């Protein structure tokens, strides 16, 4: 039907791609390949090279100068695009030979296969002070040529391309997570009990999520408030491992429970970007150049492998806490609250026959 393409400043190279978003199925990964047109007389060095590469890149230390970002090469792969090599004796997709015929016998192919369990596309919410380039996980490829591998980049004679490493929600349904907890107190042996339940474990962006909570008050004291929490968890790994979370939304129910009684109710919350622009570092799906991508989808792990992957990983959990009236011989000295939380998933389905376009409402 149609394809993308780009050309070099030197007016001698042209690239062609079938898609920019590539799917990871956890159990496997999509292959990537394509063809490039070249100008023979424009080159006499007898060597041409290209290199797909993945790395984690972002502001290095405090380097304010544009483009000064740390470059951690999580994966690198390269090929001498031309002249051909005996390692290229592998089959090709039909569309490739079709494009060769469409172009003639003066273009050469390229192919790569991703090793599973690499960090997926992600970006960190850049605040107004973050006027520099974006920070996040990137997958990119570049085209070039030279007479000796020691040769470095050349501005007029190079071009780079970017892609996204994404995934789609598993089709099969998952379990319904639910949890209960018990709390005892030291002057009355009638312990508190609690329970919360959800509808399902997967959800779509913009779709409300509802929770059902049961209350078991067995003691003299009384519940005063109930906090509703939905917190994003961010996994960080550049030099070592680190963990911290940010809340996207929350609510504090005003319900109260009389001594030695029980109660139940249901609550609903909806995450959305508008109420969270100001916050730095929010988990955002991989942008292309400047698109206002929605919140980052939860990153499913590499199945049961549970390897010590590098890069960034994200998930979400809902939590609830109870405020209990102080009193007795304790006063402000002791602690009173109880809480419980459950995990879940939030993510887009697999596109049917059309992956998302680039900011349809162009303005």
């Amino acid at each position: 039907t149609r394809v993308f393409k780009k050309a070099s400043p030197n007016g001698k190279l042209t690239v062609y791609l079938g898609k920019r978003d590539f799917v990871d199925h956890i159990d496997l990964v999509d292959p990537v390949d394509g063809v490039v047109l070249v100008d023979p007389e424009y080159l006499k060095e007898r060597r041409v090279y290209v290199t797909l590469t993945c790395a984690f890149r972002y502001g290095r230390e405090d380097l304010d100068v544009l483009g000064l970002t740390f470059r951690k090469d999580l994966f690198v792969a390269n090929v001498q695009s031309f002249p051909p090599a005996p390692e290229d004796k592998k089959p090709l997709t039909r569309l490739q030979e079709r494009l060769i015929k469409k172009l003639g016998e003066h273009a050469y192919p390229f192919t790569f296969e991703i090793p599973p369990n690499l960090p997926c596309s992600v970006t960190l919410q850049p605040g107004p002070e973050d006027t520099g380039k974006a920070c996040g996980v990137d997958y990119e490829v570049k085209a070039f040529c030279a007479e000796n591998l020691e040769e470095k980049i050349h501005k007029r004679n190079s071009v780079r391309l970017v892609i996204r490493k994404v995934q789609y929600a598993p089709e099969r349904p998952g379990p319904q997570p639910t949890a209960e907890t018990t709390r005892q107190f030291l002057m009355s042996d009638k312990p508190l009990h609690l329970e919360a339940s959800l509808d399902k474990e997967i959800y779509y962006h913009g779709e409300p999520i509802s929770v059902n909570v049961h209350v078991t008050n067995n003691t003299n004291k009384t519940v005063k408030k109930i906090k509703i929490s939905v917190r994003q968890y961010a996994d960080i790994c550049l030099f070592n491992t680190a963990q911290y979370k940010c809340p996207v939304a929350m609510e504090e129910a005003d319900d109260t429970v009389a001594p030695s009684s029980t109660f139940c109710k249901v609550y609903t919350l909806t995450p959305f970007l508008a109420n969270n622009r100001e916050k730095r570092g929010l988990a955002l799906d991989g942008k292309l150049k400047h698109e206002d991508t929605n919140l980052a989808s939860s990153t499913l792990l590499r199945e049961g492998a549970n390897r010590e992957i590098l890069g960034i990983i994200v998930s979400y959990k809902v939590k609830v806490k109870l405020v209990v009236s102080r009193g007795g011989l304790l006063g402000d000295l002791a602690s009173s609250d109880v809480a419980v939380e459950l995990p879940f998933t939030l993510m887009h389905p697999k596109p049917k026959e059309e992956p998302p376009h680039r900011e349809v409402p162009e303005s």
Partner: antibody
Amino acid sequence: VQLVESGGGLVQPGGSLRLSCAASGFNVYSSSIHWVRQAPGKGLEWVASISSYYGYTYYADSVKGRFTISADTSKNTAYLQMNSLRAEDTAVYYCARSRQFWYSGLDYWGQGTLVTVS
Amino acid sequence: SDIQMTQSPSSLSASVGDRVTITCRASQSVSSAVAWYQQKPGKAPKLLIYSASSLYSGVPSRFSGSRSGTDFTLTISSLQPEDFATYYCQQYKYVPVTFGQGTKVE
């Protein structure tokens, strides 16, 4: 699932009303809304739209400023702000909804509404 | 600048079963961010084709359309009596969004 709209009628020029469009089954964040008018015997012309998830608003220059939209998540309904009304603006207005992820068409359309002046 | 859109022919009269095409073109490239719409007198519009080729659920096969460079076309392989209605070519690549004048069947 259907959408119901109301808030128009017969007036004299200058004033304005609050046309409304009520949703059902799905929240605003799940989608985005637009508005279109049809002059008698003429085609269709986009007038306004709302992006609740992103919070942007967009309006035709023909009505920029003099028209605005409002809505509430809990109410599951939107209201049409406008002022400085021209009698020649009399047209048949329609409410419709499109997916936020991702805009590719308009599936649901309301019964429409009309305005007029004497 | 908005998308100045031209669509023709305006309308056609003929017998049932014949193939008739409606064409559409724009002032600038729109890749494939185009759609077509239908409406009947006193009734709300209806979506027919999106992404310039995609067929909506429940559409009989005879509905068809295709892209040709910066020119666009919708067509029915063989018409039926119930198909007498109004049709519109529609773009969505840029704001302000713009429609065509429409189409007629007779």
